[PDB]
Amino acid sequence: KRLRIGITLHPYYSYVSNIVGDKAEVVPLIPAGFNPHAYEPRAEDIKRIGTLDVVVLNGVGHDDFAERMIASSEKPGIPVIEANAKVPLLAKVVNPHTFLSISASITQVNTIARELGKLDPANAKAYTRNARAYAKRLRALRADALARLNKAPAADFRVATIHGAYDYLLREFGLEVTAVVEPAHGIEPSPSQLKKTIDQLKALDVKVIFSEIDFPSTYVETIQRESGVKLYSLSHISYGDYSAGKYEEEMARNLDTVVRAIQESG
Numbered sequence: 203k204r205l206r207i208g209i210t211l212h213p214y215y216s217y218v219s220n221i222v223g224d225k226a227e228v229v230p231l232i233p234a235g236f237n238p239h240a241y242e243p244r245a246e247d248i249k250r251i252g253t254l255d256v257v258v259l260n261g262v263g264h265d266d267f268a269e270r271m272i273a274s275s276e277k278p279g280i281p282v283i284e285a286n287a288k289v290p291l292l293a294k295v296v297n298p299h300t301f302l303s304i305s306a307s308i309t310q311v312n313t314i315a316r317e318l319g320k321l322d323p324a325n326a327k328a329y330t331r332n333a334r335a336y337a338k339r340l341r342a343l344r345a346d347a348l349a350r351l352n353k354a355p356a357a358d359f360r361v362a363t364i365h366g367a368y369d370y371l372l373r374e375f376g377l378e379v380t381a382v383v384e385p386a387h388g389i390e391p392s393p394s395q396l397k398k399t400i401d402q403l404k405a406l407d408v409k410v411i412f413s414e415i416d417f418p419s420t421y422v423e424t425i426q427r428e429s430g431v432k433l434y435s436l437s438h439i440s441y442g443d444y445s446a447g448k449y450e451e452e453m454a455r456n457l458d459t460v461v462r463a464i465q466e467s468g
């Protein structure tokens with residue numbers, strides 16, 4: 203009767219909780235504290251799918267584990283909400299970190315609310331109303347961060363990141379990522395690859411590097427020393443407890459750090 207909705211990543215817990223409020227139950231597929239990049243399906247977690255009515259998926263490359271878990275469960279035909287159905291992607295591998303964008307988060311929130319409404323019509327109007335209030339808060343969060351930005355960065359403001367998570371985030375400043383240290387999503391560089399990346403940061407005069415707060419890497423100190431590139435850190439919104447407010451709290455901090463990096467470039 204009261205929908206039981208599965209989620210895969212922390213941002214989706216925040217989206218669904220804000221959409222449904224107390225009208226439905228939000229169930230994480232994997233426990234808090236586990237790195238979703240390294241998570242391997244456990245029997246205990248696959249069992250949980252059998253008690254759900256629907257699973258919300260990133261479905262564009264950040265939760266492949268969830269499709270495998272569903273296939274191995276008691277409900278392989280469980281309804282699935284493809285959150286990114288209406289989201290413009292980039293770019294050669296499609297970047298799956300659409301949740302680290304205010305505009306793409308609003309699109310995903312609206313898609314989730316519409317789809318949950320079709321599954322639970324008695325609550326369709328409430329889900330729509332809640333999604334619109336949540337989208338208003340996300341726009342305000344972005345406006346508040348931009349209220350601290352004086353100028354756009356100079357033409358020479360090149361940016362690098364350790365994890366390939368921030369292309370959508372930086373796109374909201376009209377900025378691009380020159381280089382990503384990890385050769386592929388969540389893959390540590392070899393010593394030869396890291397040396398080549400350091401050489402590239404120097405050759406292209408990269409100004410800043412955004413590292414990971416969530417599951418940090420031990421070679422970042424070497425990059426800073428060897429390249430002279432200013433270091434800032436961002437959240438993939440993937441560490442610790444699930445909470446309705448996690449997404450907005452950590453995105454506000456992400457946007458403030460990007461603004462600070464630009465402010466400190468001049």
Ligand code: NI
Pocket residue numbers: 239299365367387388438
């Ligand atoms: Ni990632």
